[PDB]
């Protein structure tokens, strides 16, 4: 299924995922496309933080959903 991933900066990354995908699995896809390590990636949905050790079925993520990927920079 298709999804939309808008970063905190306002970037809109288009990716593909399955209803049986995991948070970590998505992070890898994003990492491949962009390059940002999964450890620096954070998945927020409607303000709710999607924990890495969770599935898309936990927060009931549907298709054509808009996920917000926050980039926690360790630098300054």
């Amino acid at each position: 299924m298709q999804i939309f991933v808008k970063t905190l900066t306002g970037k809109t990354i288009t990716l593909e995922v399955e209803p049986s995908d995991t948070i970590e699995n998505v992070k890898a896809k994003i990492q491949d496309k962009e390059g940002i390590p999964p450890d620096q990636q954070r998945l927020i949905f409607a303000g709710k933080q999607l924990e890495d050790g969770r599935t898309l079925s936990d927060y009931n993520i549907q298709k054509e959903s808009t996920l917000h990927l926050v980039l926690r920079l360790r630098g300054g």
Binding site: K6, L8, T9, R42, I44, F45, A46, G47, K48, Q49, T66, H68, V70, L71, R72, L73
Partner: protein, 52 residues
């Protein structure tokens, strides 16, 4: 007029417009995060989603 931004009824009004536009159901906590940063919305949300 001249309202208080500290008041949870206002929630900065404009800053909350960006916070809600980035997908965030939180309101009060966001007002604090905005104060802690001083306008740095990105830095606020980063730490805000983690704790406070």
């Amino acid at each position: 007029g001249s309202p208080e931004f500290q008041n949870p009824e206002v929630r900065f009004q404009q800053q909350l417009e960006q916070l809600s536009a980035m997908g965030f159901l939180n309101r009060e906590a966001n007002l604090q995060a905005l104060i802690a940063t001083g306008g740095d919305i990105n830095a606020a949300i980063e730490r805000l989603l983690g704790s406070s």
